[PDB]
Design a protein around this ligand. Structure first.
Ligand SMILES: COc1ccc(C(=O)Nc2ccccc2)cc1NC(=O)CCSc1ncnc(N)c1Br
Ligand SMILES: COc1ccc(C(=O)Nc2ccccc2)cc1NC(=O)CCSc1ncnc(N)c1Br
Lengths: 252, 252
């Protein structure tokens, strides 16, 4: 592929995903999204080799709940990612529209998330920040993970390994917590620990301090509570999420 | 123990370790360090329960290369940690004094670090930020770990689990990298990826880009290079560090 193979259209995502444009392959008329990375920025971050490893892996994967990387190319000053276009926008936008999701829509999204996250773990696909703004919606309204772009909270910079500075610390156990947070936010309309200040949000997470509105049913409460465990080893596994009674009863 | 059991002396560590004072137990005249934590701060951080778990574990441990927690107590507004006093200051101060350490001193410190870190892993002791400022020196010049006090580099706050916000992500593999960085800094006088800007330091870590001065011997180069692996699973284990030829040849 070359730049000249594409007509470049309107920018996508208001810069939240970097320089991304709606695009069309000129000969086939196929609609896709093209992400433009500047080599000077990649070089200054030291991420060229890590990016190569990741896109190599992604370009060989297919899964209905992971945003697809069709391929990639480069020129003298840029690297170009050829991405699946998700026509229905982000889950964030949908939640903004509806205020909150019903039990069917939520259980279906959680199944799809669990399936995507399982597949990422088995195929060693790095993902970085699971939240509604990073979740896209396909033609049939199926959820697609898109969280691939990239003193500290991990300690002092000079002493930190590449996996910390490259955002590669979301392992299976971390993801279980994320899934609990997402299940709550889908049903309620806001994540469980949200507060006006960062300090207060910090406090609430550490204390695992949250409340369920009355409209949240017993089954949904059981799921969420079993995911949001302070002790990582105690969290309900992805396999166990897929077999949870509430998930079985409600997922499309 | 109660506050009235202690004479409180000069502040220690210039606030880098919080409110810490040289102290003496009044009846025995024993010299120690007393750390004062304000309950209002603990409450606002949401760390009361996590602190309890950690000090409970620590107060039952003894190891020559881990700073000892003798015990703890509280009153209406404060929690007090009764700590071992390390009379010879920090490894940072010593490195500042000498500019760099010889192979004997370095190998001995690395053995001691490896032993401390191994013991922490086996007894499930959390430690948070391995660097020379957090390493203290005992009466006989033995090294003692003291790194126990506490958009982000890990992602978006509302979606992060307690282990990320509580600084509990330094596992065995992370520690291997830290040990490589420390070995280099002991021998050279600065950590391998140090740069004027955070961005340039970031770049150097991700690229694993560093150079050895001429005075660094083949054996030390082999050790350091085998620890500083981009791929976490490839790093030399703590057991393998203790059996490395350079360590065997040089450690006191
Ligand atoms: C497989 O998707 C990716 C794969 C990789 C990377 C990436 O940047 N990797 C990376 C880049 C530099 C350094 C380190 C990692 C990014 C994405 N994805 C994206 O950036 C999403 C673009 S927004 C969008 N896309 C389609 N349809 C929509 N409606 C929207 Br809105
Ligand atoms: C076993 O050592 C600790 C155990 C625990 C904590 C701690 O704060 N935990 C904690 C507090 C709040 C929230 C979460 C964790 C801190 C330390 N240690 C320290 O603070 C070191 C004090 S400086 C010093 N000490 C002795 N001799 C010297 N020459 C110096 Br200088």
């Amino acid at each position: 592929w070359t730049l000249e193979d594409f007509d470049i259209g309107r920018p996508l995502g208001k810069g939240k995903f970097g320089n991304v444009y709606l695009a069309r392959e000129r000969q086939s008329k196929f609609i896709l999204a093209l992400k433009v990375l500047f080599k000077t920025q990649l070089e200054k971050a030291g991420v060229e080799h890590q990016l190569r490893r990741e896109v190599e892996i992604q370009s060989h994967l297919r899964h209905p709940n992971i945003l697809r990387l069709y391929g990639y190319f480069h020129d003298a000053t840029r690297v170009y990612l050829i991405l699946e276009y998700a026509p229905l926008g982000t889950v964030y936008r949908e939640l903004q529209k509806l205020s909150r999701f019903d039990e069917q829509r939520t259980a279906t999204y959680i199944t799809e998330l669990a399936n995507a996250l399982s597949y990422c773990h088995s195929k060693r696909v790095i993902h970085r920040d699971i939240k509604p703004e990073n979740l896209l919606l396909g033609s049939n309204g199926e959820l697609k993970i898109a969280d691939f772009g990239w003193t500290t909270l991990c300690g002092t910079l000079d002493y930190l390994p590449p996996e910390m500075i490259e955002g590669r610390m979301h392992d299976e156990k971390v993801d279980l917590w994320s899934l609990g947070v997402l299940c709550y936010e889908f049903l309620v309309g806001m994540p469980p620990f949200e507060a006006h200040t960062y300090q207060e949000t910090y406090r609430r997470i550490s204390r695992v301090e949250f409340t369920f509105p009355d409209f949240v049913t017993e089954g949904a409460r059981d799921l969420i509570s079993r995911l949001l465990k302070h002790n990582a080893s105690q969290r309900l596994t992805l396999a166990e999420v897929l077999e949870h009674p509430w998930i079985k009863a409600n997922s499309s």
